[PDB]
Structure 1
Amino acid sequence: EKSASVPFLSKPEKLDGSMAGDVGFDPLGISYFIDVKWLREAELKHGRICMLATAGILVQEVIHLPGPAFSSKFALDAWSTAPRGGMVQILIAIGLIEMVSNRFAITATDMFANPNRKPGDLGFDPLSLGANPATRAKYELSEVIHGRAAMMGLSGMIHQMIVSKQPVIDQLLNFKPVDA
């Protein structure tokens, strides 16, 4: 009757525990008015993008592609210094990827029209690592927890970089507390 994550609040009715990472955490009751399938698809997309974002922010500080345009340890500066044509190309490619991966069903009215369409399942398994039922549940839980952790980490990284005006590793190695 009561949520596991927040004992004093009641268990979210729409969260039946089937989905991985379900601890009954929905204090604001978004799941009541928004389909949990759409919510989980969005959660997985955000978590995957933030996983890649954290990895990129941490890696492109140490290893860069050749060229002055790509030579930028600070990620917010890299955003501006990287070739603008290349960034627009990445944007167009992301758009085409969304379209093809979602199979022209990219709206809240048609995304899950096919019963076979499952939340967050875009048909992406190049090496077929998810075909094992024994490890599939563990992999799903790991993916959800990784997405959540990476979302929090990416947010923290972006804003600590706004504050310190220095890369993440450089900040941690030469920390200077905030003064005005």
Structure 2
Amino acid sequence: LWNEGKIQGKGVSVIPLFPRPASLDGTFPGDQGFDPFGFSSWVNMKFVAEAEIKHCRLAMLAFAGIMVESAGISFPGATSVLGSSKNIFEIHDKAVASGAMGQILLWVSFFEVVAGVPAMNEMLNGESSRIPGYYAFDPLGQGKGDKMGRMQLSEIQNGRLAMLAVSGIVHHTLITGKGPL
């Protein structure tokens, strides 16, 4: 859940080497110390929270995409038009050349301008009281108490791990020439 005081709260440090700053408030889902360079002092906390959740969600989805495309798993006929390789880099370059990446770019950017930018503008202006990262996207239930509680903390930690792991995977593929799995 929250575990305020235990984990993700005031008096919570991931690395007590760095003292927990005062400017870092204790009400943002995922706040467990870790503000060395003092960014929370001057950045908009709502903006950086939304940016963190969005970086988290891309990292998770990209990790899933890397795993599927490095295990050889595909959709029917995808390997027919695209390459047969499992190099994530090679697939990206050939799916760009196929137009598939252009279609994903088109539709992501459409959602991100017609919905993402107004949502960001209102969440930071103070016209809607939308918590960061919220898009009312809960089709398969699993909300209620969990939605504002453990799931927010589970999401943010799985996302931070996904960011670190995705960066790891791409750089391992770079330095080796062989991907994972």
TM-score w.r.t. the length of structure 2 is: 0.81
Q: What is the rounded CA distance, in whole Å, between the counterparts of 1:38 and 1:23 in structure 2?
A: 18
Could you tell me how far 1:17 is from its partner in structure 2? 2.0
Change in 2 beyond 3 A, CA 1:133/1:106: closer
Asked if the contact 2:47/2:120 (under 8 Å) is kept, the reply is no
Quote the residue 2:114 is aligned against: 100
1:47 and 2:59 aligned:
no
Aligned residue identity for 1:55 = A
Q: What is the rounded CA distance, in whole Å, between the counterparts of 2:59 and 2:146 in structure 1?
A: 27
Could you tell me how far 1:72 is from its partner in structure 2? 2.4
Which ranges in structure 1 are unaligned for 5 or more consecutive residues?
A: 170-180
1:72 and 2:94 aligned:
no
Q: Deviations over 1:63-94 (max 9, x none)?
A: 12311415321101101122532211111111
Change in 2 beyond 3 A, CA 1:89/1:5: same
Asked if the contact 1:12/1:24 (under 8 Å) is kept, the reply is yes
Q: Deviations over 1:113-155 (max 9, x none)?
A: 224221111222122322x215641111100001000000000
**Structure 1 stretch 51-60 or stretch 14-23: which is displaced more?**
14-23
SS at match of 1:119: coil
Q: Deviations over 1:32-51 (max 9, x none)?
A: 11011111111110011000
Which ranges in structure 2 are unaligned for 5 or more consecutive residues?
A: 1-9
1:156 and 2:157 aligned:
no
Asked if the contact 2:123/2:129 (under 8 Å) is kept, the reply is no
Change in 2 beyond 3 A, CA 1:124/1:24: same
Change in 2 beyond 3 A, CA 1:151/1:134: closer
Q: What is the rounded CA distance, in whole Å, between the counterparts of 1:119 and 1:75 in structure 2?
A: 31
Aligned residue identity for 1:16 = D
Asked if the contact 1:105/1:111 (under 8 Å) is kept, the reply is yes
Quote the residue 1:10 is aligned against: 19
Change in 2 beyond 3 A, CA 1:168/1:129: same
TM-score w.r.t. the length of structure 1 is: 0.81
| RMSD of Structure 2 on Structure 1 (CA) | 2.2
1:63 and 2:77 aligned:
no
Could you tell me how far 1:106 is from its partner in structure 2? 4.5
Identity of aligned residues (%): 36
Name the count of aligned residue pairs. 166
Q: What is the rounded CA distance, in whole Å, between the counterparts of 1:106 and 1:16 in structure 2?
A: 21
